Structure 1
Amino acid sequence: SVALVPHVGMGLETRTETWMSSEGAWKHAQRIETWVLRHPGFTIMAAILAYTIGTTYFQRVLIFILLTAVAPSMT
């Protein structure tokens, strides 16, 4: 759908508030949080996979964050 491609990072923003700035500010974070709450099993698997693949704790945390954020996203 078109809603999958919003107008967020187009570089045209001004001091005027955008269309749904307040609404659409934290909606992605809220959606990710709800998805992680509803699917704890994938979060555990993503954590384990990040620990296995990552060598340093920085890599592990980054991979865990990326996987958790992409899982609901690619759906």
Structure 2
Amino acid sequence: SVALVPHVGMGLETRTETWMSSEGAWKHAQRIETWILRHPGFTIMAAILAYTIGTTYFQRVLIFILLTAVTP
């Protein structure tokens, strides 16, 4: 639901801070990294995929950080 649409990039901003104010970003990171810690295997397999496909080293890096981003 409203759980995701969280009106971010959008526009209009302003000179004054808005709401979660230097949190929700570091929130976003901390939670996804947490979930990484919980399910290491999926990291493993994914990384393997990175070493499989493309692999053009920089490519590997990219698609890897992707497969990190992939968890909802």
TM-score normalised to the size of structure 2? 0.91
Q: Percent identity?
A: 97
Cα shift at 1:54: 2.3
Tell me by how many angstroms 1:35 deviates: 0.7
Whole-angstrom CA distance in 2 between matches of 1:2 and 1:36: 24
Local SS of the residue matching 2:16: coil
The Cα RMSD (Å) is 1.1
Residue 17 of structure 1 aligns to a residue whose secondary structure is coil
State the Cα distance separating 1:23 from its structure 2 match: 2.1
**Displacement of 1:57:** 0.8
Q: Give aligned pairs, total.
A: 72
Secondary structure in structure 1 of the residue aligned to 2:70: helix
Larger deviation, residues 40-49 vs 5-14: 5-14
1:41 CA drift (Å): 0.3
1:13-40 deviations in whole A, cap 9, x for unaligned?
1110011122212111111110110000
What is the aligned partner in structure 2 of residue 15 from structure 1? 15
Unaligned runs of 5+ in 1: none
Q: Give 1:60's aligned residue.
A: 60
